Design a binder for this molecule. Structure first.
Ligand SMILES: N[C@@H](CCC(=O)O)C(=O)N[C@@H](CCC(=O)O)C(=O)O
Lengths: 166, 280
């Protein structure tokens, strides 16, 4: 899965997520390309947690999205929560270590303290550190300041994400 | 100029997207260029063998194009990418298609420098995928090394066929025959692929209007969670990790549950303040 965001001179925002559904799909390969695997989640489309998104207010436009399978909205929600409540730059927030939940487990990007682990233990979530950066996604975003007319962005180092504006 | 920007998970996609925009192109035209480049240079993650979705929000219009794969009569879906891009071009684009495929074609034919992430992806995938068909990705039996130039001649051929014939170059003819043989999918299912145009889900959150991806995508779930986090004021606990985490776990299982019971009807109503009010 890959997510990109584009904003043009007309202020049109595209937010797109494309995928093969596992890295190199099924791995089957023909005519120079890899074939997707289809999750069983005729011409039916399966359910996906992909969620390309745009947010707009007077004065601000945001295009945002992420890869990360069934974790996607778990990845995006704390990011947008912190951003809209003033915690810092979208890029700093994106850089912050992440966590997601799967049934009763909390997957954590860093080693948490015994202090916080035990609070979660009697909650009672158990905690497990995931060793793949790609597991916690790859958030890509652009933000247009609509007053002043400037575009900034953020990319996720977990995927070597970057951004540019004019 | 005028202001414009690209954010993507590969620097060559960023570069090619910026090039389109610098020369006066639209967000849609750049997105087609970017999508095809990513299929070439970030090939582990997306491409012509897959699908996707695209949200387009202009001053005057909101559109969601669904080009996710469809199930035929391993599990491989009929690829939607090529049909998506052509549909997007014909209905929302500006420049002719041929021009937009050319940057991707150049990276296929001339090559690009592989990075550390593609090497590692190949390394980790080798047990699942490595076959006698994959020699260009595993030179001398090992994952192609960071810094090395990867040239994709077969893919250039396919992309040039699509460049010349349109979507028929993928969904019919020799390419369609290749897909049929490899995926065990009928020529009929391949040719019958259709894109869906959908209305974006629209809600509000923190004084923002929010446009997101509708069913079968999960924009409803994301917006519910955002609205739940706003209402429950979880941000007040952001400095207190166990509380923040626990409260986020609660919000996510509520929303995931709601998606589940409704996997088996208005998405705008599902992200409304009143719907969020009743969520438990
Ligand atoms: N473990 C898989 C499946 C998760 C799911 O769909 O429930 C996974 O993480 N999939 C992702 C892999 C690709 C990526 O770049 O994240 C996905 O988004 O398809």
């Amino acid at each position: 899965t890959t997510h990109f965001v584009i904003i043009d001179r007309d202020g049109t925002v595209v937010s797109s997520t494309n995928t093969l559904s596992n890295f190199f799909g099924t791995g089957k390969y023909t005519a120079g390309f890899f074939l997707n695997n289809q999750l069983q989640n005729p011409g039916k489309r399966s359910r996906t947690f992909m969620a390309p998104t745009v947010l707009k207010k007077d004065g601000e436009t945001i295009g945002i999205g992420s890869p990360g399978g069934n974790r996607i909205p778990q990845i995006l929600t704390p990011i947008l929560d912190k951003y809209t409540h003033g915690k810092g730059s979208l890029q700093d927030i994106i850089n912050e270590y992440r966590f997601t939940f799967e049934k009763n487990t909390a997957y954590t990007e860093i080693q948490l303290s015994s202090e916080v682990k035990n609070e979660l233990s009697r909650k009672g979530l158990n905690v497990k550190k995931k060793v793949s950066p790609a597991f916690f996604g790859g958030v890509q975003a652009l933000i247009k300041d609509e007053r002043d007319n400037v575009i900034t962005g953020a990319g996720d180092g977990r995927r070597n994400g970057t951004w540019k504006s004019n | 100029k005028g202001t414009y920007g690209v954010s993507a998970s590969h620097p060559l996609a960023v570069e090619e997207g910026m090039k389109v925009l610098k020369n006066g192109g639209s967000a849609v035209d750049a997105a087609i260029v970017v999508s095809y480049v990513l299929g070439v240079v970030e090939l582990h993650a997306s491409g012509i063998g897959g699908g996707g979705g695209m949200l387009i929000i202009s001053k005057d219009k909101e559109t969601f194009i669904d080009y996710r794969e469809t199930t035929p009569y391993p599990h491989i879906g009929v690829p939607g990418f090529v049909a998506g891009m052509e549909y997007i071009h014909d209905n929302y684009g500006s420049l002719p298609m041929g021009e937009l495929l050319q940057p991707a074609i150049n990276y296929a034919e001339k090559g690009f420098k592989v990075d550390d992430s593609l090497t590692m992806r190949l390394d980790l995938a080798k047990p699942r995928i490595y076959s006698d068909k994959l020699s260009i990705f595993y030179p001398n039996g090992e994952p192609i090394e960071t810094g090395e130039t990867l040239i994709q001649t077969d893919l250039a051929r396919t992309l040039k066929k699509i460049q010349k014939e349109g979507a028929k170059g993928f969904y019919e003819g020799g390419v369609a025959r290749a897909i049929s043989k490899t995926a065990k999918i009928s020529l009929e299912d391949i040719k019958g692929y259709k894109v869906e145009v959908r209305k974006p889900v629209k809600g509000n959150y923190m004084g923002y209007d929010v446009y997101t991806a509708p069913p079968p995508f999960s924009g409803v779930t994301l917006l519910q969670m955002l609205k739940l986090a706003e209402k429950k004021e979880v941000y007040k606990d952001v400095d207190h990790t166990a509380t923040y985490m626990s409260k986020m776990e609660e919000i996510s299982r509520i929303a995931y549950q709601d998606r589940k019971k409704n996997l088996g009807m208005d998405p705008n109503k599902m992200v409304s303040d009143k719907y969020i009010s009743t969520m438990k």
